[PDB]
Amino acid sequence: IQRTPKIQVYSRHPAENGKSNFLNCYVSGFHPSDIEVDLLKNGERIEKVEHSDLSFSKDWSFYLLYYTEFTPTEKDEYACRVNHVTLSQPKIVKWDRDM
Amino acid sequence: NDVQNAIDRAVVRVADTMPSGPSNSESIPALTAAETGHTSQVVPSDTIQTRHVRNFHVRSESSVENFLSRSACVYIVEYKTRDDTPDKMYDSWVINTRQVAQLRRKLEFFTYVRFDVEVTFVITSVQDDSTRQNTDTPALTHQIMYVPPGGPIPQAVDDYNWQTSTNPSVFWTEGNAPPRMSIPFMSVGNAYSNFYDGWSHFSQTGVYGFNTLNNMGKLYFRHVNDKTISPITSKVRIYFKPKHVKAWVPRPPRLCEYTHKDNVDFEPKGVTTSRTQLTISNSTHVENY
Amino acid sequence: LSLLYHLTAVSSPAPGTPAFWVSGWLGPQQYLSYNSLRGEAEPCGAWVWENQVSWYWEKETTDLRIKEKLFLEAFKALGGKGPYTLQGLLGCELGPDNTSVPTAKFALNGEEFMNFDLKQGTWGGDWPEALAISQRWQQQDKAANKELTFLLFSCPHRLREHLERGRGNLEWKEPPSMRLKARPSSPGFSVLTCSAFSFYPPELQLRFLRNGLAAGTGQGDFGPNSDGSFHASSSLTVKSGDEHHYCCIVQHAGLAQPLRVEL
Amino acid sequence: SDRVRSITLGNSTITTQESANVVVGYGVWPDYLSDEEATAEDQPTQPDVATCRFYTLDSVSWMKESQGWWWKFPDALRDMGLFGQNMQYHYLGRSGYTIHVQCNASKFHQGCLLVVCVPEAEMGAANINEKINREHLSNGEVANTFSGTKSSNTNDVQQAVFNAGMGVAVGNLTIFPHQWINLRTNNCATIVMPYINSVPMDNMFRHYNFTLMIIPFAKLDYAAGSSTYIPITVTVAPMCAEYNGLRLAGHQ
Amino acid sequence: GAQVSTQKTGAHETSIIHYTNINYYKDAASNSANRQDFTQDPGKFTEPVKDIMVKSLPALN
Amino acid sequence: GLPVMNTPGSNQFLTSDDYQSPTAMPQFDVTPEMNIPGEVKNLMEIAEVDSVVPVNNVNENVNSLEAYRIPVHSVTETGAQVFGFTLQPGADTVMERTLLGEILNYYANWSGSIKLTFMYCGSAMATGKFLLAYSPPGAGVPKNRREAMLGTHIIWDIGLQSSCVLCVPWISQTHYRFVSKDIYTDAGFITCWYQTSIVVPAEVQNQSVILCFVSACNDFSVRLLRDSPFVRQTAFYQ
Numbered sequence A: 001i002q003r004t005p006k007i008q009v010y011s012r013h014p015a016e017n018g019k020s021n022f023l024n025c026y027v028s029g030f031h032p033s034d035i036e037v038d039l040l041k042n043g044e045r046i047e048k049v050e051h052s053d054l055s056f057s058k059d060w061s062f063y064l065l066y067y068t069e070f071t072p073t074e075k076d077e078y079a080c081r082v083n084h085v086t087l088s089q090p091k092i093v094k095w096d097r098d099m
Numbered sequence B: 001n002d003v004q005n006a007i008d009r010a011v012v013r014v015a016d017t018m019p020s021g022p023s024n025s026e027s028i029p030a031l032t033a034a035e036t037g038h039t040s041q042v043v044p045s046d047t048i049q050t051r052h053v054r055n056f057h058v059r060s061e062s063s064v065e066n067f068l069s070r071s072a073c074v075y076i077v078e079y080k081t082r083d084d085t086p087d088k089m090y091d092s093w094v095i096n097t098r099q100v101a102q103l104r105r106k107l108e109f110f111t112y113v114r115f116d117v118e119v120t121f122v123i124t125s126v127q128d129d130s131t132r133q134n135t136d137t138p139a140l141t142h143q144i145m146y147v148p149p150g151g152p153i154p155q156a157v158d159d160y161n162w163q164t165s166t167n168p169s170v171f172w173t174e175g176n177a178p179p180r181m182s183i184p185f186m187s188v189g190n191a192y193s194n195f196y197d198g199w200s201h202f203s204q205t206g207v208y209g210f211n212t213l214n215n216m217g218k219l220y221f222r223h224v225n226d227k228t229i230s231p232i233t234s235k236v237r238i239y240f241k242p243k244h245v246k247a248w249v250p251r252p253p254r255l256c257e258y259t260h261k262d263n264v265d266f267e268p269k270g271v272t273t274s275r276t277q278l279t280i281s282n283s284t285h286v287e288n289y
Numbered sequence C: 001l002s003l004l005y006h007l008t009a010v011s012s013p014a015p016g017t018p019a020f021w022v023s024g025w026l027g028p029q030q031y032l033s034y035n036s037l038r039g040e041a042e043p044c045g046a047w048v049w050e051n052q053v054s055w056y057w058e059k060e061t062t063d064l065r066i067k068e069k070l071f072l073e074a075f076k077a078l079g080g081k082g083p084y085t086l087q088g089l090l091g092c093e094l095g096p097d098n099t100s101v102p103t104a105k106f107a108l109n110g111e112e113f114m115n116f117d118l119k120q121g122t123w124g125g126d127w128p129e130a131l132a133i134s135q136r137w138q139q140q141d142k143a144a145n146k147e148l149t150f151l152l153f154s155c156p157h158r159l160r161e162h163l164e165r166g167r168g169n170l171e172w173k174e175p176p177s178m179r180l181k182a183r184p185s186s187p188g189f190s191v192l193t194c195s196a197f198s199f200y201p202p203e204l205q206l207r208f209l210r211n212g213l214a215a216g217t218g219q220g221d222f223g224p225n226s227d228g229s230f231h232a233s234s235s236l237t238v239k240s241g242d243e244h245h246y247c248c249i250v251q252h253a254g255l256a257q258p259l260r261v262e263l
Numbered sequence D: 001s002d003r004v005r006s007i008t009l010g011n012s013t014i015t016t017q018e019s020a021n022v023v024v025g026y027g028v029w030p031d032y033l034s035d036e037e038a039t040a041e042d043q044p045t046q047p048d049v050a051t052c053r054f055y056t057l058d059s060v061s062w063m064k065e066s067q068g069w070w071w072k073f074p075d076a077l078r079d080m081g082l083f084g085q086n087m088q089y090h091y092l093g094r095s096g097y098t099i100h101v102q103c104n105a106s107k108f109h110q111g112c113l114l115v116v117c118v119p120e121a122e123m124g125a126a127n128i129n130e131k132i133n134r135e136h137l138s139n140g141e142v143a144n145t146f147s148g149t150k151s152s153n154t155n156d157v158q159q160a161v162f163n164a165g166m167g168v169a170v171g172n173l174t175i176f177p178h179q180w181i182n183l184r185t186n187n188c189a190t191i192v193m194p195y196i197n198s199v200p201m202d203n204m205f206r207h208y209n210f211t212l213m214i215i216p217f218a219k220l221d222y223a224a225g226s227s228t229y230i231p232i233t234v235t236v237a238p239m240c241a242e243y244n245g246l247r248l249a250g251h252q
Numbered sequence E: 001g002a003q004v005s006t007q008k009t010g011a012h013e014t015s016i017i018h019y020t021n022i023n024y025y026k027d028a029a030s031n032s033a034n035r036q037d038f039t040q041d042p043g044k045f046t047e048p049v050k051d052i053m054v055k056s057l058p059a060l061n
Numbered sequence F: 001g002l003p004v005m006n007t008p009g010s011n012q013f014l015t016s017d018d019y020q021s022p023t024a025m026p027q028f029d030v031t032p033e034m035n036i037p038g039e040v041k042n043l044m045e046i047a048e049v050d051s052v053v054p055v056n057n058v059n060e061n062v063n064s065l066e067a068y069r070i071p072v073h074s075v076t077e078t079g080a081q082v083f084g085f086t087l088q089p090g091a092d093t094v095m096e097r098t099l100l101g102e103i104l105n106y107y108a109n110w111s112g113s114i115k116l117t118f119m120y121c122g123s124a125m126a127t128g129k130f131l132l133a134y135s136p137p138g139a140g141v142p143k144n145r146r147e148a149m150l151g152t153h154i155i156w157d158i159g160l161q162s163s164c165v166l167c168v169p170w171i172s173q174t175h176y177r178f179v180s181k182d183i184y185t186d187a188g189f190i191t192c193w194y195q196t197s198i199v200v201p202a203e204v205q206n207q208s209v210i211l212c213f214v215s216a217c218n219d220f221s222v223r224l225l226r227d228s229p230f231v232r233q234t235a236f237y238q
């Protein structure tokens, strides 16, 4: 009884400079009840991160979405660190500006 | 004979008291050994001097048939004749003798019992509080249905599972005699197992206790009449009367109180009641006024 | 349309984490948020946009309190060692005209083990844990008669109520915006990237075209946002050349034409 | 003299010189199932004299503060030779039992044990509504000990000597076939118990037939120079054992 | 197809007895109660032993 | 048809009926009977069986196993009292929750003689004598040893036979006695007195335990059915 998760880090609006944007980190396909997900602004943890409701899919496996508000920049990058039961080290996923 | 019919005609009185006198010999009925599981049978003529008392007492009303064959209430049923939610217009009850502690303890004197049931329904209707208090509703009609385990089950009060082509049912008209009917021994085993020290599955897991050997089906209750103009509730009282009773392998009565209806689980109650002390004495400048 | 209820209870919760949460699903997106730490459900305010005065939120509250009491009762009869997760799928779907078909499924530790037989009105499974929990839920002996009417006279009633109360909030329609790009890879290879921003129905089909001939579907990636919009993305490994030829054709219900997208 | 008793079963023999008596059930001797009360439609397996012999359980130490012990014989003898293996390959089973409890001391010791055999002894849990694991009801080897107060453990039997794990008075619990081991007079206790169930043959892993209980009412007490270790040994022998429904190996 | 049996009368003194009973239904479970069986047997519980004691002997030694 | 006049008392529901009623399962096949050992045809087969009496009803000893132990030791006086209690099987709290009292709490009236088996659970070399007495009512509880031996008593010596049966007879003016505590149907008192002391040799402990039993004789009877005052519930057991 163990399911390794799947991480997708993306954005709602296109990455236009000067305009506000929403970052979304979506973890899906796992069955512990506890997961430790943080958002990182070039290594520094984002303080105010709101959450959605923890539901499950058709295969009885969880999914959790975190979202935050930012302004996209060519220099600025973002990461989503996920600590999980299956992960001996916390997996860090870098945000892509196209995916 | 067996216990159904066709003659008893037998009156068995208690033993009498034979006279005795002085004695000085090696026959000592007092010196016994209670360690062997042997209850001593000391007659009062064996220790003191008695007289010829012809005793006419009969151990009649202390028998098991004279102890259990009285109608005790086991369950109360409440349901209305019109509602917005259809779960309060009809009613169901899984059949057990475990929700009223009097008849439950009366059956839990013995481990295995074998009897026939005499079921009586006493139905009382109460007009609920509403705006239209003054109505002209006729006499109500109730339907009481039995469902064996595995049969079809209704989902509302207008379902077509109330046709009862095979299921027995009682139609009661308000104002008449209460319904009463007899029911034979419908158990799979040779006797009703009151306590079952065992599991449900072969790997010694699952549910534990007597919670697997009930298997009796369940009762259903509804108003035969249609939707009225004012809510009127009805409460029926199920009365079981165990007759033709045989019993085997008894046990001491329950000391603690009950907690639930499907296990023997309890909170530890003490043995007896203290008074003040261990010995007794005379009065205390007598205060029996 | 298909009304669903996702209920989840755990044995040993974290501090600050509720031990019981319910999420309601009218089709693709959520309308309900119930937890054990507060005692009431709260909307997202995108379905009726109107305060239903005490006959919609004083009934779901009591029903979910009954479900909370049953699911928190359903952890004491199991003598196992590790932690538990009792998930439940409870809902219904509307038929051709009437006589809606409900669905009741239960799962422990991510594996389905019992359902709720409507003809006999009883929770039924195969495992000893299934028989234990199904026997414990009929110890309350007033809960099977409540779920037998909740899945047959309350959920189709709420389904036919939300059928026409919020018809403007059932016709969600926005055209998704494409940003088709590429990225360099291992020497000789490159990776295309076809995205899809803020499309409201979940159905979307992506495919790759070299010049006018199909080249495959790639790898589908999908994810909801925090407001109801959905995001999709796909990629395909191609050669180092030919990147000025690819025209990814996308079709969607918010578009009246398969709009060709050029880099 | 009736203090010396020699009981011989199979290839085993117990000889005692300070016995008391033998309580044989409710007046009924263990016997095979008759042809009228039978249910299954095949020949029962009456194996040998190697399944009707005295098997010796493990010993327990009886201190001054000890409270009691309880065994479960259709689960305790699951590994006692060919009686256990015939439990695993068969579905049904029917047998009576002969239980002999040894407990010896000197004339300087005092104390008294109550040895009962309670059919259908359904145990109550320590917590109110929690489920009891299978290892806290029966163990096979060394038995579970009664407590002296209100026991409260996670998924465990209620252990109170004034309720005996059932909710009845322990002084009224002598309605069952019982004996006493009094160190003034006795040395052993012998109880013969027939098959008591509402079915003629029943499964032996799923159903617990009866429960032995050895409870000290008069506690153990002795001088500052007497022997300190007084063991209690339980030796049990099945009688008239028969089996039915041969199949593959069952659940341990 | 009637039967005649004695009533439960008083003691030591006393037509007024020998009532009648007729069975009307085709099932044995439909019959009345068996409240006349007075036969007891206190030998299975008291004296549940072999080597039966004499009650005048010390039953040991 | 037949002219039938309805009698008063029709269309009612009495609890202890003896009427007939139709069968809801017609021509049902009952499973055959199997000879199960330990058949009970009378509740008097249970009440004649010995059961340990909780004599030690001092507080803090009820919620333990000490409630059944009767303590005894060597006394520097030779005429002290061991224990004592009223003879009320159903009203006195000594034999209230005992098996005989558990039977007689369902029965308002009772009559017959009572057996009391006293076993000694000391060392094998301890010896002594006791005076087990019973006093009929009319006077108070006896305070000396000479006032207790004027009733129905027995002097028991401790030897190889460890048990002793005090057989309280039926001395009354009525044929029955109420099980509840009243003034008219008084019964008597059970007392136990030191006849001699307990002589103990060296390196043998002194404090030992006497156990008590109770059972009915072959002339015991109970008459009126009633509900027991012990069964108390508030709601159902769902």
Ligand SMILES: CCCCCCCCCCCCC/C=C/[C@H](O)[C@H](N)CO
Binding pocket: B095, B096, B097, B107, B113, B117, B119, B145, B146, B168, B169, B170, B183, B186, B192, B193, B194, B213, B214, B216, B219, F024
């Ligand atoms: C048309 C018939 C309707 C009435 C049906 C209700 C009574 C029939 C149900 C079966 C009777 C079982 C009564 C209890 C039997 C055992 O004593 C219990 N399992 C506990 O010992």
Ligand SMILES: [K+]
Binding pocket: B013, B014, B015, B016, B055, B056
């Ligand atoms: K007589």
Ligand code: NA
Binding pocket: B028, B029, B030, B031, B032, B033, E055, E056, E057, E058, E059
């Ligand atoms: Na004797």
